[PDB]
Design a protein around this ligand. Structure first.
Ligand code: CLA
Ligand code: CLA
Ligand code: CLA
Ligand code: CLA
Ligand code: CLA
Ligand code: CLA
Ligand code: CLA
Ligand SMILES: CCCCCCCCCCCCCCCCCC(=O)OC[C@H](CO[C@@H]1O[C@H](CO)[C@H](O)[C@H](O)[C@H]1O)OC(=O)CCCCCCCCCCCCCCCCC
Ligand SMILES: CCCCCCCCCCCCCCCC(=O)OC[C@H](COP(=O)(O)OC[C@@H](O)CO)OC(=O)CCCCCCCCCCCCCCC
Ligand SMILES: CC1=C(/C=C/C(C)=C/C=C/C(C)=C\C=C\C=C(C)\C=C\C=C(C)\C=C\C2=C(C)CCCC2(C)C)C(C)(C)CCC1
Ligand SMILES: CC1=C(C/C=C(\C)CCC[C@H](C)CCC[C@H](C)CCCC(C)C)C(=O)c2ccccc2C1=O
Ligand code: SF4
Lengths: 80, 41, 124, 143, 35, 73, 740, 165
């Protein structure tokens, strides 16, 4: 499926997870940010690449990136 | 007055004023100098 | 899921039950023969009517019959292609690969038989 | 959460008529998703696959063909009535997978029990150029 | 040397009907070829 | 090619003959141009002028050139 | 129960909010920082549902906006009457309407545009107008320019009154929500007062003013020697001489002997041979009957006096077994949602505009209207396009209601819920119908073109080879030709000349004549039905899938107007209902363009022309029976055979039509860069221009940004529609003025 | 007599075009009585056409083979054949006016940035300040080249927003 990569510039604001319509991201404990939270993608096989997480990222550039490629039944959003 | 003046100070109103000013200037120039093409004093 | 009066009508249910495709009471060869007969008989219709030789009497029916036979053969080739390229991997024998091959053979046999029957009916 | 709940197919479905955008043949060929919630009272909600339904006072079970529909229903129930539902995924062979509350605390929380995966530890824009990774099968963002 | 007069009556239907038909048949079997 | 070689001003070059069973009789009659026995297409690629310029004159030369280029391919 | 509920002075008339451009929404209240704010200023200006969540303030804003639009309309009408009063040859046109072209716009000689003031006749120079205002004023009994001046001054006064009324009813005395929700009182007052009372007043004007002036004009007397309408109003001797039944003096009306009024309230259905228009007595009895029917219908609903009908009770009572809750929650929907009422009003208004265009080309309800071919063509095309725009806005605002104002609590098993519940079957069946129609019409056209290019005229679907005649339309035409014979024996002749009969001509030009229907007419009618079906499919798919879909289950949370949901699931570009309306606008444009092309060609070939002693010689010689069956026929015998007047109009008064034609081609071509492409390219180009202006230290404080994807689509569809509309307008007007 | 072209006064097609225009104007004029406003309008149009045709001649304008005057754009060639007033002087005048516009816009951009919310001044224009900068732009090239000399016209590449490579 698609590739979801999260960098260290994330501030743990949990906006990307709330904007996710397929429950791909998660919040794990961290020490590199003030909020002590870091975004993770343990369910990247269910991500369709809608880039809704990138819209909700408040940091400049993007702390979360979605790269398309190798579309599957789950990645193409097919009910059939 | 000053609220109406700031409304007149908005960009579309002053653009409209420039539009009427420039159009009237060019139209009066064309009317009182009928169809010129080459600058010949 | 959304049931309708026309889809769940008992008359519609028994009309679709005894159809050759949904009978599930015979070999695929007989169903293919019936399908080919019916569809060739109806497909010969527009060919004996509006073909390029429709103004010429006699030859119009023959030309339409060979065109219907060619269309039947093309449909049989596409049926065989679908059977070979659809059921190539793992209770109805029609959904099987060789079952669909026998269905296609019955379909082309019925198609040529229906074309010949339409030719006989147009001649008489 | 502490113990992963097991789905019950005998739980009553919410009061609804017939759906057209419901489960297709993929439900009997591939996996399909099933959402469960616990309604304290009967009320009308809007399904993502059609019109409106009425949930029963008790357990409620619904079936969908896409995980996005399940999460849309979940977030609608959480925003409108604070329902906290949960959906499973059932394959063709009957394998049941727990999907939304992986630790039972929802992904908005942390719970100090999830290991962060697929996290690049370098800043964005510090990735190597595609010329550096050529004829290797490794993307610049996958390292 | 010079082709016969029936060559347009044979090669044109061959490359207009038969050859594209067998090409599409081969391509259809190649698209849906599974393991 | 030979008729165009003899008179390069008046008669038009022929690209390829047309064999279309969907053609009607007025369409067959209207496409008979350049002194041909059937429906032909008037050549606009300019290979007639080029092959006249390089020295090709007979149809046998074009035949052997075509078979040699097929062998080369 | 029904009473006036008005709040006194809720909004103070202060200019403090005129200084701040963005004030209606909190998003724009923070001030501008990018240029996309400015477009957002001009996009959410009338989005009153987004500014406030209170329905009362939205209703007050709607009332004020309607008053403003009526004031604008009255200003435009007063300006039209003023232009007819001063810069017009209406008095010259009244002397000889069959030789002087109607002109009401005069240009200033500045840069050589004075050549646009063509020789319209009657010692006047101006632009030949196609609005038909001259025929409307002749139908209203207007003779001198003083009456037009008085009408213009009254229109300006009423426009100022309506503008002050909007200011008063918003700022001073704002009606409450309960005042707007009295739908029964609104319907009763509109049926009885807005429509019926106006119909009776216009009927009385036609009886007392328009009929004698029109009769004297048809008699051939001097318009200057025609007595003034007040002489007919006060003194009864002239009205008794013109109509003996006026000598009774309202006796037959109050003694129920209405047959005595048959001299000036006639039923002679057809065209007046003197002027080629509808009989004014027929229009008088028509508007009188319409007024009576609407005053009857306006006493239907119960408001405050017990008797009447309840709309909610009627809607809840009409429930069948196959529909569940039949029309249950619709009363609450239409009394709370402005957008549902907007969709209903726009759909019915557009359909009625199409009806107006059809029944106005069919029956010209104006003296010397059918002789002016340009006026009839322009009016038909204009009403056609306004109707199409209204019926596509109906789908747009229906989708807006679906996104915003739909409540699933009030819609459990009602009709809207079941429509949403089988929307997939609806869309699939409509798609199949559209595909089948497009095949069996456009493929028929391609078949005709191929068999024409293959030299097989006997293989074509023409009027000579394969007779696919419209037997139903021909049977209906024959039945309506015999409508006065057996089923409506009180009518003197047929209700229109399109069904059949003879040829009515005015001044040597044919006003109306029977229209023959052949295979080409059947082909173009089925093509029109196919295009309408496709547009209906697009707009219905936009409306029904506005909330959710299999592709996107949470489309309602994304709003009505969003560009996309990213490239996920393969790509979700143009998935919103707004994008569906944007796509359907082009299909509406294509449908109406084909419709008006069919109208222009059919009426130029089989209706319009000149009348000589040998017969009726049409403009194009009746090629529609042999050329309209192929696409190349429209390409050559309709688009290339015509449009020669547009390209040869240079150096004459019609050259502005050619310039407008070129500009319309330009705008249509310029729209394609917004229709195609995207946003990131222009954003990076703007970044490069930002670097260029930053090098020179002339970078603006407001950051320039590329247009939004929705904004870019809107700009593209707007410029595309404007270019196509003005192209057809210029081509039609130039062709119909030069040769007509 | 450059580019193989003849002067408009010496040309025959120019006089033929003028005669054709006068003929069609007279044909339009003959349909109206002399005591009517369209007659005076057409007489004024004919007088304007005659004045324009006289002014195009005896002014250095030349036409080739169609009577439509042609313009010479190369400086020097236009200088030695008195064709500088065709495009050479108007292009300098347009450059002067365009520099006026650019200098006025630059002055308004710079002078409205050292204050709170410069976008508010951008969207609601300071009309007295705009008019003052309008009447102070008559010496735009002097101020432009002086800003070039002192380096305030151009920004350095360190304070300029730049796209990643
Ligand atoms: C970009 C190309 C271009 C150029 C170089 C010109 C140049 C000219 N045209 Mg043209 N024009 C253009 C585009 C252009 N126009 C377009 C796009 C249109 C259509 C909208 C027109 C429509 C048009 C008309 C209808 C007329 C002209 C006229 C003129 C003259 C200018 C008259 C004037 O403004 O008063 C002079 C004004 C000034 C010098 C301003 C002085 C202000 C201060 C003092 C400095 C000049 C020969 C007129 C003319 O004389 O024809 C030859 C005329 O009748 N043009
Ligand atoms: C029989 C009485 C009557 C009449 C004639 C009208 C007439 C009208 N109403 Mg109204 N309405 C009425 C009663 C009436 N209303 C009642 C009782 C209610 C409350 C239930 C409403 C609630 C209502 C709403 C909510 C809206 C209208 C609107 C309109 C306009 C529709 C647009 C149109 O057709 O243009 C026709 C235009 C003309 C004929 C031009 C002349 C218009 C004149 C000035 C109006 C004169 C009639 C007026 C009602 C007399 C009373 C006002 C008096 C105190 C001065 C029209 C002017 C719409 C609107 O706001 O438009 C401004 C609108 O949205 N009506
Ligand atoms: C709205 C439409 C309309 C209008 C305005 C009129 C108006 C008129 N018609 Mg017409 N008519 C109409 C429709 C109309 N009719 C229709 C539908 C038909 C059916 C075919 C006719 C058939 C018809 C015939 C056959 C005749 C008329 C005639 C008349 C006139 C007689 C009026 C009369 O006695 O009525 C009754 C009028 C009143 C009772 C007056 C109203 C009460 C007043 C206004 C009270 C004022 C009080 C006020 C406070 C005090 C003054 C104020 C001041 C001090 C400042 C009048 C000009 C007759 C005519 O022209 O001869 C004179 C005639 O022969 N009409
Ligand atoms: C009965 C009339 C009516 C009414 C009262 C409304 C009211 C509304 N509509 Mg609707 N609409 C209508 C007809 C109507 N519409 C029709 C006929 C169409 C189809 C064309 C639409 C299509 C439509 C869409 C697609 C949308 C709306 C929206 C809206 C809302 C805000 C509109 C706004 O802010 O525009 C502000 C004004 C403008 C943006 C100016 C528009 C100017 C156009 C694009 C170009 C004008 C060209 C002009 C004719 C020629 C210019 C030439 C040039 C050289 C000068 C509001 C609820 C919007 C919304 O959010 O709904 C809630 C929305 O998305 N409407
Ligand atoms: C002339 C160009 C053209 C054509 C042919 C189509 C064709 C189609 N569009 Mg459309 N469309 C076009 C331009 C065109 N579009 C443009 C410019 C836009 C932008 C506004 C759109 C926007 C648009 C939308 C928004 C929708 C469509 C839809 C459709 C379908 C309707 C099917 C139908 O009724 O006709 C049947 C098809 C034809 C008549 C095609 C003509 C070709 C011949 C006659 C068919 C046979 C060819 C030949 C004999 C077979 C060759 C075999 C082999 C050699 C290849 C169809 C696929 C709708 C859809 O999906 O289906 C309902 C739909 O919703 N289109
Ligand atoms: C294509 C459709 C069509 C159209 C446009 C017409 C139009 C016409 N016909 Mg024709 N007709 C048609 C089909 C059509 N007809 C088919 C037949 C065969 C049965 C006939 C048989 C026929 C005869 C025998 C006669 C006509 C006549 C007429 C004329 C007047 C008819 C009239 O009063 O209608 C009513 C007019 C209205 C304005 C009513 C409109 C009502 C609106 C749309 C609302 C309707 C809501 C509805 C009641 C709700 C549905 C209820 C339902 C659920 C039960 C008119 C020119 C007559 C004639 O010769 O003309 C003088 C005549 O004698 N027609
Ligand atoms: C790069 C653009 C360009 C081009 C193609 C030309 C082309 C021409 N110029 Mg020009 N020139 C230009 C720009 C240009 N000029 C500029 C910017 C100036 C300064 C204002 C001049 C000043 C100039 C002079 C002074 C003369 C020419 C002359 C000429 C001609 C011959 C030039 C030569 O070397 O012999 C030729 C038509 C000469 C001419 O007219 O032919 C003898 C001539 O005397 N030019
Ligand atoms: C009370 C009184 O006499 O008020 C007379 C009114 C208002 O008079 C004054 O107005 C001021 C604001 O200009 C303040 O509101 C004052 O309080 C008010 O007394 O004067 C008018 O001229 C009436 C308004 C005329 C224009 C109406 C346009 C409405 C919009 C239609 C579009
Ligand atoms: C072509 C379009 C066919 C649509 C068929 C379904 C219509 C929608 C539908 O289900 O309608 C069902 C309807 C009968 O339903 P009811 O009588 O229960 O509806 C009553 C309420 O509408 C009040 O049948 C018809 O209207 C017959 C004509 C259909 C045409
Ligand atoms: C003589 C002549 C000619 C020629 C010319 C030429 C050849 C030119 C060149 C030129 C060049 C070769 C140039 C260059 C340049 C460069 C640069 C680098 C620039 C810059 C600029 C700037 C920077 C500007 C600025 C400004 C603005 C924009 C605004 C404000 C003001 C100012 C001015 C400051 C011709 C024939 C055509 C025509 C006639 C005349
Ligand atoms: C060109 C283009 C742009 C760039 C267009 C922009 C930035 C809009 C520019 C509008 C200008 C500023 C309007 C005013 C133009 C003139 C300066 C005003 C008239 C001047 C005369 C009176 C002198 C997009 O942003 C875009 C977005 C989405 C899809 C397609 C496109 C698209 O095609
Ligand atoms: S939206 Fe961005 S900054 Fe916020 S938690 Fe997600 S990756 Fe981090």
């Amino acid at each position: 499926a698609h590739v979801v990569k999260i960098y260290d510039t994330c501030i743990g604001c949990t906006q990307c997870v709330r904007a996710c319509p397929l429950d791909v991201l998660e919040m794990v404990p961290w020490d590199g940010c003030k909020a002590a939270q870091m975004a993770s993608s343990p369910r990247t096989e269910d991500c369709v690449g809608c880039k809704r997480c990138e819209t909700a990222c408040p940091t400049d550039f993007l702390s979360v990136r979605v790269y398309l490629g190798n579309e599957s039944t789950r990645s193409l959003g097919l009910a059939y | 007055m000053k609220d109406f003046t700031t409304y007149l100070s908005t960009a579309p109103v002053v653009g409209l004023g420039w539009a009427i000013f420039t159009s009237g200037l060019l139209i009066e120039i064309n009317r009182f100098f009928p169809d010129p093409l080459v600058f010949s004093f | 899921m959304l049931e309708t009066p026309v889809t769940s009508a008992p008359i519609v249910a028994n009309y679709l039950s005894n159809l050759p495709a949904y009978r599930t009471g015979v070999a695929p060869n007989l169903r293919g023969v019936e399908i080919g007969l019916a569809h060739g008989f109806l497909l010969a219709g527009p060919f004996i009517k509006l073909g390029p030789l429709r103004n010429v009497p006699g030859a119009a029916e023959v030309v339409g019959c060979m065109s219907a036979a060619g269309l039947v053969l093309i449909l049989a080739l596409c049926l065989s292609l679908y059977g070979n390229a659809a059921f190539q991997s793992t209770q109805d024998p029609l959904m099987s690969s060789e079952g669909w091959a026998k269905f296609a053979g019955g379909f082309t046999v019925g198609g040529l038989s229906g074309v010949a029957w339409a030719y006989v009916l147009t001649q008489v | 959460p502490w113990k992963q709940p097991e789905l019950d197919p005998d739980t009553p479905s919410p009061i609804f008529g017939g759906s057209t955008g419901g489960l297709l043949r993929k439900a009997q060929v591939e996996e399909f998703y099933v959402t469960t919630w616990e309604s304290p009272k009967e009320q009308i909600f809007e399904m993502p696959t059609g019109g409106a339904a009425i949930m029963r006072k008790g357990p409620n079970l619904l079936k969908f063909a896409r995980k996005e529909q399940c999460l849309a229903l979940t977030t609608q129930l959480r925003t409108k009535f604070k329902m906290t539902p949960c959906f499973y995924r059932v394959y063709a062979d009957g394998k049941v997978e727990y999907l939304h509350p992986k630790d039972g605390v929802y992904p908005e929380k942390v719970n100090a029990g999830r290991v962060g995966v697929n996290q690049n530890m370098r800043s964005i824009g510090e990735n190597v150029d595609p010329i550096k990774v050529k004829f290797t099968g490794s993307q610049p963002f996958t390292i | 040397f010079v082709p016969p007069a029936w060559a347009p009556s044979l090669f044109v239907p061959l490359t207009g009907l038969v050859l594209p038909a067998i090409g599409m048949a081969w391509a259809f079997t190649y698209i849906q070829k599974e393991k | 090619f030979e008729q165009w070689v003899t008179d390069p001003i008046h008669v038009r070059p022929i690209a390829h003959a047309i064999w279309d069973p969907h053609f009607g009789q007025p369409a067959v009659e209207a496409f008979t141009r350049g002194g041909a026995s059937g429906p032909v297409n008037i050549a606009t690629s300019g290979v007639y002028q080029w092959w006249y310029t390089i020295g090709l004159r007979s149809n046998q030369e074009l035949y052997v050139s075509s078979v040699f280029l097929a062998l080369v391919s | 129960k029904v009473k006036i509920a008005v709040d006194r002075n809720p909004v103070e008339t202060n200019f403090e909010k005129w200084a701040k451009p963005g004030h209606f929404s909190r998003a724009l209240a923070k001030g501008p920082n990018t240029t996309t704010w400015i477009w957002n200023l001009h996009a959410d200006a009338h989005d009153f549902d987004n500014h406030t969540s209170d329905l009362e303030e939205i209703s007050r804003k709607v009332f004020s906006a309607h008053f403003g639009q009526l004031g604008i309309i009255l200003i435009w009408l007063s300006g039209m009457y003023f232009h007819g009063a001063r810069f017009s040859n209406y008095e010259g046109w009244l002397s000889d309407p069959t030789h002087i072209k109607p002109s009401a716009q005069v240009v200033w000689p500045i840069v050589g545009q004075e050549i646009l003031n063509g020789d319209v006749g009657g010692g006047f120079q101006g632009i030949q107008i196609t609005s038909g205002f001259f025929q409307l004023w002749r139908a209203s009994g207007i003779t001198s320019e003083l009456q037009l001046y008085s009408t213009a001054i009254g229109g300006l006064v009423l426009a100022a009154a309506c503008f002050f009324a909007g200011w008063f009813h918003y700022h001073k005395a704002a009606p409450k929500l309960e005042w707007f929700q009295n739908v029964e009182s609104m319907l009763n007052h509109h049926l009885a007062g807005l429509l019926g009372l106006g119909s009776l007043a216009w009927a009385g004007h036609q009886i007392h003013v328009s009929l004698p002036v029109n009769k004297l004009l048809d008699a051939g007397v001097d318009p200057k020697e025609i007595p003034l309408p007040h002489e007919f109003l006060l003194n009864q001797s002239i009205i008794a001489d013109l109509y003996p039944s006026f000598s009774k003096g309202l006796a037959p009306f109050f003694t129920l002997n209405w047959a005595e009024y048959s001299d000036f309230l006639t039923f002679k259905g057809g065209l007046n041979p003197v002027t080629g228009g509808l009989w004014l007595s027929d229009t008088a009895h028509h508007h009188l009957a319409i007024a009576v029917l609407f005053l009857v219908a306006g006493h239907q609903y119960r408001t405050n006096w017990g008797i009447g009908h309840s709309i909610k009770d009627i809607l809840e009572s009409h429930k069948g077994p196959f529909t569940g809750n039949g029309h249950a929650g619709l009363y609450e929907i239409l009394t709370t949602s402005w957008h549902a009422q907007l969709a209903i009003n726009l759909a019915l208004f557009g359909s009625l505009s199409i009806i107006v265009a059809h029944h106005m080309y069919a029956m010209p309800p104006y003296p010397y209207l059918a002789t002016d071919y340009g006026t009839q063509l322009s009016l038909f095309t204009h009403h056609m396009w306004i109707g199409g725009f209204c019926v596509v806005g109906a789908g747009a605002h229906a989708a807006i209601f679906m996104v915003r104002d739909y409540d699933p609590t009030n819609n459990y098993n009602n009709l809207l819920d079941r429509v949403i519940r089988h929307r997939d079957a609806i869309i699939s069946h409509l798609n199949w119908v559209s595909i089948f129609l497009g095949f069996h019409s456009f493929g028929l056209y391609i078949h005709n073109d191929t068999m024409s290019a293959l030299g097989r005229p006997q293989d074509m679907f023409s009027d000579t080879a394969i007779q696919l005649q419209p037997v139903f339309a021909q049977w209906i035409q024959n039945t309506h030709f015999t409508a006065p014979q057996l089923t409506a024996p009180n009518a003197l002749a047929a209700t229109s000349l399109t069904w059949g009969g003879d040829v009515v001509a005015v001044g040597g030009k044919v006003a109306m004549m029977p229209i023959a229907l052949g295979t080409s007419d059947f082909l173009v009618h089925h093509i029109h039905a196919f295009t309408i079906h496709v547009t209906v499919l697009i707009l219905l798919k936009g409306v029904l899938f506005a909330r959710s879909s299999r592709l996107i289950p949470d489309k309602a949370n994304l709003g009505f107007r969003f560009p996309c949901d990213g490239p996920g699931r393969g790509g979700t570009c143009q998935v919103s209902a707004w994008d569906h309306v944007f796509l359907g606008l082009f299909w509406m444009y294509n449908s109406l363009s084909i419709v008006i092309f069919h109208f222009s060609w059919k009426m130029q070939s089989d209706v319009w022309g000149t009348v000589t002693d040998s017969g009726v010689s049409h403009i194009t010689g009746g090629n529609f029976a042999q050329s309209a069956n192929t696409i190349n026929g429209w390409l050559r015998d309709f688009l290339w055979a015509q449009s020669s007047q547009v390209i040869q109009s240079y150096g004459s008064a019609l050259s502005a039509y050619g310039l407008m034609f070129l500009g319309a081609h330009f705008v249509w071509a310029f729209s394609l860069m917004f229709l195609f492409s995207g946003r990131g390219y222009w954003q990076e180009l703007i970044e490069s221009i930002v670097w260029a202006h930053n090098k020179l230290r002339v970078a603006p404080s407001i950051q320039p940004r590329a247009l939004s994807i929705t904004q870019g689509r809107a700009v593209g569809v707007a410029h595309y529609l404007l270019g196509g509309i003005a192209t057809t307008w210029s081509f039609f007007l130039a062709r119909i003025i030069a040769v007509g | 007599d450059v580019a193989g072209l003849t002067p408009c006064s010496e040309s025959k097609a120019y006089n033929k075009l003028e005669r054709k225009e006068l003929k069609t104007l007279e044909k339009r004029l003959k349909k109206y009585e002399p005591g009517s406003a369209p007659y005076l309008a057409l007489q004024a149009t004919k007088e304007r056409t005659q004045n324009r045709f006289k002014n195009y001649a005896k002014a250095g304008l030349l036409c080739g083979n169609d009577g439509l005057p042609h313009l010479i754009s190369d400086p020097g060639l236009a200088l030695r054949f008195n064709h500088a007033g065709e495009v050479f002087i108007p292009t300098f005048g347009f450059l002067y006016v365009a520099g006026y516009i650019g200098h006025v816009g630059r002055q308004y951009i710079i002078k409205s940035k050292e204050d709170a919310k410069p976008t508010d001044k951008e969207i609601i224009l300071d009309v007295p300040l705009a008019l003052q900068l309008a009447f102070q732009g008559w010496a735009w090239p002097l101020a432009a080249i002086q800003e070039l000399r002192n380096g305030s016209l151009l920004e350095k590449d360190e304070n300029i927003t730049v796209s990643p490579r």
